[PDB]
Amino acid sequence: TGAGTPSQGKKNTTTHTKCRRCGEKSYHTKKKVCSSCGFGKSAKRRDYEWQSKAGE
Amino acid sequence: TDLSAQKRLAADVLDVGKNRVWFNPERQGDIADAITREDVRELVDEGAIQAKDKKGNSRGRARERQKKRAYGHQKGAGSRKGKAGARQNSKEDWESRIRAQRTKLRELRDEGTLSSSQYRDLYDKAGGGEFDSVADLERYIDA
Amino acid sequence: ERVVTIPLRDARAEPNHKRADKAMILIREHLAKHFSVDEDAVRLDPSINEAAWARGRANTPSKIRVRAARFEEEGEAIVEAE
Amino acid sequence: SWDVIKHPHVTEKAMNDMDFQNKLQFAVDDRASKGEVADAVEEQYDVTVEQVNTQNTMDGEKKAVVRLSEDDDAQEVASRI
Amino acid sequence: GKKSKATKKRLAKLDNQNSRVPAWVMLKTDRRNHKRRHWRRNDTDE
RNA sequence: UGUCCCAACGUUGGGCCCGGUGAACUGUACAUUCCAGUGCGGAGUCUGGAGACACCCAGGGGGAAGCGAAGACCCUAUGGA
RNA sequence: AGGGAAACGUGAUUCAACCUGGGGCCCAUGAAAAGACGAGCAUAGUGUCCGUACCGAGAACCGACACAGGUGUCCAUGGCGGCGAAAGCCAAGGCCUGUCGGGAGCAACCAACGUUAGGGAAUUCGGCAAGUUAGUCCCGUACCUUCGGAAGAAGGGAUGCC
RNA sequence: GUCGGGUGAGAACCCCGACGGCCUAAUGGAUAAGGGUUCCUCAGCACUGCUGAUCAGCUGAGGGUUAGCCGGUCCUAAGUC
RNA sequence: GUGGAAGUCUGUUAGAGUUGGUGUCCUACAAUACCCUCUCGUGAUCUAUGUGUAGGGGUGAAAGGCCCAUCGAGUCCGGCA
RNA sequence: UAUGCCAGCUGGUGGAUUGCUCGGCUCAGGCGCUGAUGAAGGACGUGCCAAGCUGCGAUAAGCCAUGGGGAGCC
Ligand SMILES: [Cl-]
Ligand SMILES: [Cl-]
Ligand SMILES: [Mg+2]
Ligand SMILES: [Mg+2]
Ligand SMILES: [Mg+2]
Ligand SMILES: [Mg+2]
Ligand SMILES: [Mg+2]
Ligand SMILES: [Mg+2]
Ligand SMILES: [Mg+2]
Ligand SMILES: [Mg+2]
Ligand SMILES: [Mg+2]
Ligand SMILES: [Mg+2]
Ligand SMILES: [Mg+2]
Ligand SMILES: [Mg+2]
Ligand SMILES: [Mg+2]
Ligand SMILES: [Mg+2]
Ligand code: NA
Ligand code: NA
Ligand code: NA
Ligand code: NA
Ligand code: NA
Ligand code: NA
Ligand code: NA
Ligand code: NA
Ligand code: NA
Ligand code: NA
Ligand code: NA
Ligand SMILES: [Sr+2]
Ligand SMILES: [Sr+2]
Ligand SMILES: [Sr+2]
Ligand SMILES: [Sr+2]
Ligand SMILES: [Sr+2]
Ligand SMILES: [Sr+2]
Ligand SMILES: [Sr+2]
Ligand SMILES: [Sr+2]
Ligand SMILES: [Sr+2]
Ligand SMILES: [Sr+2]
Ligand SMILES: [Sr+2]
Ligand SMILES: [Sr+2]
Ligand SMILES: [Sr+2]
Ligand SMILES: [Sr+2]
Ligand SMILES: [Sr+2]
Ligand SMILES: [Sr+2]
Ligand SMILES: [Sr+2]
Ligand SMILES: [Sr+2]
Ligand SMILES: [Sr+2]
Ligand SMILES: [Sr+2]
Ligand SMILES: [Sr+2]
Ligand SMILES: [Sr+2]
Ligand SMILES: [Sr+2]
Ligand SMILES: [Sr+2]
Ligand SMILES: [Sr+2]
Ligand SMILES: [Sr+2]
Ligand SMILES: [Sr+2]
Ligand SMILES: [Sr+2]
């Protein structure tokens, strides 16, 4: 069984969903954590300096 | 004219598979005007829409064959496919035999012909597979 | 109008699982020729259709007697079994 | 403050319910309960509500099918709006 | 699947948005919905 | 026992012709070549001869050191893992 | 009551479901909790909130596609067949959308495949490929063996219909 | 698939009948996930559809999912916060 | 004779797998597909869903296998021009 | 003279060029905190017809007062 096309047919699990806090489809319904804004993980909003060029 | 929708409604009103409903060739125009289930029932009573009959497989050839086999024919070596134990379950056959032999022995006892002790000796022999059948048992009882 | 005998052996040139189809073509071509009319103007009564497909799509009869009439302002023919 | 009854739901299916089952159909606030729908209707048209069936629609609204008592006539009630 | 009431509201909105730009807007602006979606060719969120 | 001697005939789908639909690979230029030679020693294009009226259809692929991949082998880098 | 144009059956066999027992196995021991029963009856009232369409696949899902792939459950008792939930044929039901057609005894060549005299592995690294054998019953069965096996060894005979 | 016929400006492939076929653990019936209106009706053929199209999962416009007793909702499992 | 054990045998039952053809395909139906043959099919079995283990870390009946077409150290962005 | 070569002509295709600028880029001066009295952000609504943007919030492209403004506006 190839890792490619044939293995793609087994994918019918819902993980990432519309996030209550930020509105992005990043709320992982299994972990109950938003990979985009951090909801469910932290009160503070998920943010990182590497999201932009260092001097900008 | 396109009557596929009507075909679906007719199948439901006639309670039959769609492939069995017949629409009169000369009335496509009227049927095409049929919108409601009521319009369909109407055309059904007129006979413009009817249900073709479903077939059932004939069993005549099977019956003759069944008779031959019930009489013991058509079961020679060349007509068998399964193993012997598959054609007749052996444990099942032993259950048939042993039960027949025990019923026999039980009737002879209550009837008086056999004393509990004679009955016992025969019952344990039967259980040990001493008799091929009831007749075999009777023939034995007669010394 | 007259009765004609159509030979269908040329249907053997077509693959065997489709002889019936070819037969219906040879019939239209034979009539159109012999009644001097366009193939588009030849009408085959379903009776002829059932005759050629009697034994299924792969078994056409070697010949077939057909009764055809010729007429009208544009010139056309109508055929059927016999 | 949100109201209960939004507006009459007028469609062929609604008309039939009104002509054959003495039922009225309404678009109502999706937060309204079957009971709150019953009250609102009795207090807006002065009639007797017998049963209420609801459905959250694919249009984002809640639809209510309100059956009136035999003492009332849906056809006439709806005819005054 | 099984849709919650909120999921339903969102699907409903997406359906509504998926409509043509009214004819009169054409005239008024003297001459296209860029958010037109197809159930099959596209994929909504969630 | 068609693997072979040794190949034959046949069947179905293609292939071929017609309607419709309709891509891609590839393209420095020129280009009808062949035999020799020459040249960075493995040339359709240089030299000498030979041959060569233009275009088109089908074919099996001899050549374009054919197309497809900045050689995997080998070495080199005061390269990496 | 309903349903049926009508009749609007009766017995039987084999018996999925479902019910209830007996036996055997473990250096393996085969959930928990809410709840229910225990604990009667009449009448009346209340029972809100959310889901509910459709596809479920050789076009509705995932695979960039209306993709020959992938993707769970139940229908496991429709008829003949036979050991059979096997083959083959046929119902109920579904379909002609595993979606471009027209024409040429329709050439070469290719993919799948049928039949080949005599020789019979000479072919090839190699019997690769293809073929040979075949179901069931009876007879019969070697070396060897950890005594289980080897074994369907091998070899021989039978097989329809009435 | 074929012969007739229906509709239409237009019909090999949209519909009717007949004849001929295909599918039987599936090409039939009910569904889980997932999709999200793809469901039904009317009107359409510029787009989408391996050709055509009057057809459609396509385009325009409307319509459709009704529960004390079917799920959820309640309980706790591995385990999570 | 009974009994009915077995990481027991046959078996395209379901289901799981893949020895050979070095067949077909190789701008594919398909970025691992198709056909025939072949192996397993009461158990160290197969399978759905839920759930846990995370990057010098997992997971591994061990092939440097697998951890979303990527693994002798995933992916994303940043360091970074 | 067919297939065809080179250059041009008329017409396409294409969107270079020229001209234009409701957008950028950079500099300078001013100014500078918000939130449990629920912010910032998001979701969903809200229009006669309304898909997108903007505004607004069930009083939903808006309500009230004062000053400005003015014969138009939506
Ligand atoms: Cl017992
Ligand atoms: Cl449900
Ligand atoms: Mg229509
Ligand atoms: Mg036994
Ligand atoms: Mg055939
Ligand atoms: Mg409800
Ligand atoms: Mg709509
Ligand atoms: Mg080469
Ligand atoms: Mg290199
Ligand atoms: Mg090396
Ligand atoms: Mg190193
Ligand atoms: Mg297809
Ligand atoms: Mg021979
Ligand atoms: Mg040799
Ligand atoms: Mg072999
Ligand atoms: Mg699992
Ligand atoms: Na409304
Ligand atoms: Na989709
Ligand atoms: Na041969
Ligand atoms: Na060549
Ligand atoms: Na049977
Ligand atoms: Na077609
Ligand atoms: Na024993
Ligand atoms: Na293999
Ligand atoms: Na790493
Ligand atoms: Na400031
Ligand atoms: Na708008
Ligand atoms: Sr494996
Ligand atoms: Sr596969
Ligand atoms: Sr899955
Ligand atoms: Sr947390
Ligand atoms: Sr931060
Ligand atoms: Sr709607
Ligand atoms: Sr898709
Ligand atoms: Sr060629
Ligand atoms: Sr029984
Ligand atoms: Sr349903
Ligand atoms: Sr499939
Ligand atoms: Sr049938
Ligand atoms: Sr088509
Ligand atoms: Sr012969
Ligand atoms: Sr040999
Ligand atoms: Sr040899
Ligand atoms: Sr033998
Ligand atoms: Sr099915
Ligand atoms: Sr047209
Ligand atoms: Sr439809
Ligand atoms: Sr076994
Ligand atoms: Sr087996
Ligand atoms: Sr190989
Ligand atoms: Sr082969
Ligand atoms: Sr390959
Ligand atoms: Sr068994
Ligand atoms: Sr991978
Ligand atoms: Sr960088």
Start-to-end CA distance of chain E, whole Å, equals 12
Whether the beta carbon of E4 falls within 7 A of nucleic chain J: the reply is: no
Which chains share 3+ C-beta pairs under 8 angstroms with E?
A, D
- What string of H, E and C letters represents the secondary structure of D11-80? CHHHHHHHHHCCEEEEEECCCCCHHHHHHHHHHHHCCCEEEEEEEECCCCCEEEEEEECCCCCHHHHHCC
Q: How far apart are CA A54 and CA A35, in angstroms?
A: 22
Q: How far apart are CA C70 and CA C65, in angstroms?
A: 16
- What string of H, E and C letters represents the secondary structure of C5-44? EEECHHHHHCCHHHHHHHHHHHHHHHHHHHCCCCHHHEEE
* Contact criterion met (CB below 8 Å) for C23 and C31: no
Number of separate domains in chain D: 1
| CA→C1' distance for C41 and G96 (Å) | 28
For residue C74, the enclosing domain spans 1-82
The amino acid occupying position C4 is V
Whether the beta carbon of B91 falls within 7 A of nucleic chain G: the reply is: no
Residue whose structure tokens are 């039967």: B126
Whether the beta carbon of E37 falls within 7 A of nucleic chain J: the reply is: no
The amino acid occupying position B99 is R
What are the structure tokens assigned to B48, written together?
A: 């413009």
What are the structure tokens assigned to B54, written together?
A: 């479903």
- Could you tell me the fold of the domain covering B89-143? 1.10.1200
Start-to-end CA distance of chain B, whole Å, equals 92
Q: In 3-state terms, what secondary structure has residue E16?
A: helix
Q: How far apart are CA B47 and CA C22, in angstroms?
A: 38
Binding residues of A for Zn(2+): 19, 22, 34, 37
- Domain coordinates in residue numbering, chain B: 1-55, 56-88, 89-143
Residue A18 near chain E (CB below 8 Å): yes
* Polymer length in residues for chain D: 81
What are the structure tokens assigned to D17, written together?
A: 């319910």
* Contact criterion met (CB below 8 Å) for D37 and D65: no
Residue A25 near chain E (CB below 8 Å): yes
Q: In 3-state terms, what secondary structure has residue C71?
A: strand
Number of separate domains in chain A: 1
- Planar angle of CA B12, B17, B22, nearest 5 degrees: 85
A contact residues 27-56, partner E, Cβ 8 Å cutoff:
none
What are the structure tokens assigned to D78, written together?
A: 């709806």
Start-to-end CA distance of chain D, whole Å, equals 24
Number of separate domains in chain C: 1
C-alpha C34 chain-centroid distance: 12
What are the structure tokens assigned to A25, written together?
A: 């489809």
Choose from D56, D57, D61 for mutation: most chain E CBs within 10 A.
D56
What are the structure tokens assigned to D10, written together?
A: 């007028």
What are the structure tokens assigned to C40, written together?
A: 């588009």
Q: In 3-state terms, what secondary structure has residue E10?
A: helix
Min Cα distance E28 → chain A (Å) is 34
Beta bridge partners, D63, equal: D27, D55
CATH classification code of B1-55: 1.10.1650.10
What residue in E sits closest to A24 (Cα-Cα)?
E45
Q: How far apart are CA A16 and CA A28, in angstroms?
A: 4
Q: Which CATH superfamily is E1-46 part of?
A: Ribosomal protein L39 (1.10.1620.10)
How many A from CA of A2 to the centre of ligand 10?
A: 30
C-alpha E37 chain-centroid distance: 6
| CA→C1' distance for B89 and I41 (Å) | 24
With breaks defined as C to next N over 2.5 Å, after which residues does chain A break? none
Residue whose structure tokens are 């948005």: E17
Beta bridge partners, D5, equal: D28
Output the domain CATH number for residue D37: 3.30.70.330
Contacts made by residues C70-74, CB under 8 angstroms, sequence distance 24+: C70/C1, C70/C35, C70/C37, C74/C41
Output the domain CATH number for residue C61: 3.10.440.10
DSSP codes, chain B: ---HHHHHHHHHHTTS-GGGEEE-GGGHHHHHT--SHHHHHHHHHTTSEEEPPPP----HHHHHHHHHHHTT-S-SGGG--S-HHHHS-HHHHHHHHHHHHHHHHHHHHHTTSS-HHHHHHHHHHHHTT--SSHHHHHHHHT-
> Nearest nucleotide to D62 by CA–C1' distance?
H66
What are the structure tokens assigned to D63, written together?
A: 């639809």
Q: In 3-state terms, what secondary structure has residue C49?
A: helix
Which chains share 3+ C-beta pairs under 8 angstroms with D?
E
What are the structure tokens assigned to B117, written together?
A: 């002790």
- Domain coordinates in residue numbering, chain E: 1-46
E5 chain-D contacts, CB cut-off 8 A? 30, 56
What are the structure tokens assigned to D76, written together?
A: 């006439």
What are the structure tokens assigned to D38, written together?
A: 């019953």
Where on strand F do bases come within 7 A of a protein Cβ? 11-13
How many A from CA of A35 to the centre of ligand 25?
A: 21
D71 burial (CB, 10 Å; 0-12 / 13-18 / 19+) is: exposed
CA atoms within 13 A on the CB side of C32: 13
Is the Cα torsion angle B13, B18, B20, B21 positive or negative in sign?
A: positive
Size of the D and E interface in Cβ pairs below 8 Å? 15
* Domain B56-88 class, CATH top level: mainly alpha
Of D5, D23, D6, the closest CA to residue D14 belongs to D23
What are the structure tokens assigned to A48, written together?
A: 């990182």
Q: Which residues, 6 or more positions from B8, have their beta carbon under 8 angstroms from its beta carbon? A: B18
Q: How far apart are CA D7 and CA D29, in angstroms?
A: 10
For residue A36, the enclosing domain spans 1-56
Task: Flag residues 7-36 of E with CB < 7 Å from strand H.
Answer: 7, 11, 14-15, 18-20
Whether the beta carbon of E39 falls within 7 A of nucleic chain G: the reply is: yes
* Contact criterion met (CB below 8 Å) for C25 and C40: no
β-bridge pairing C76-80 and C42-44: parallel
Between the alpha carbon of residue B14 and those of residues B24, B35, B48, B49, C79, the distances in Å are: 15, 16, 13, 9, 38
Whether the beta carbon of C12 falls within 7 A of nucleic chain F: the reply is: no
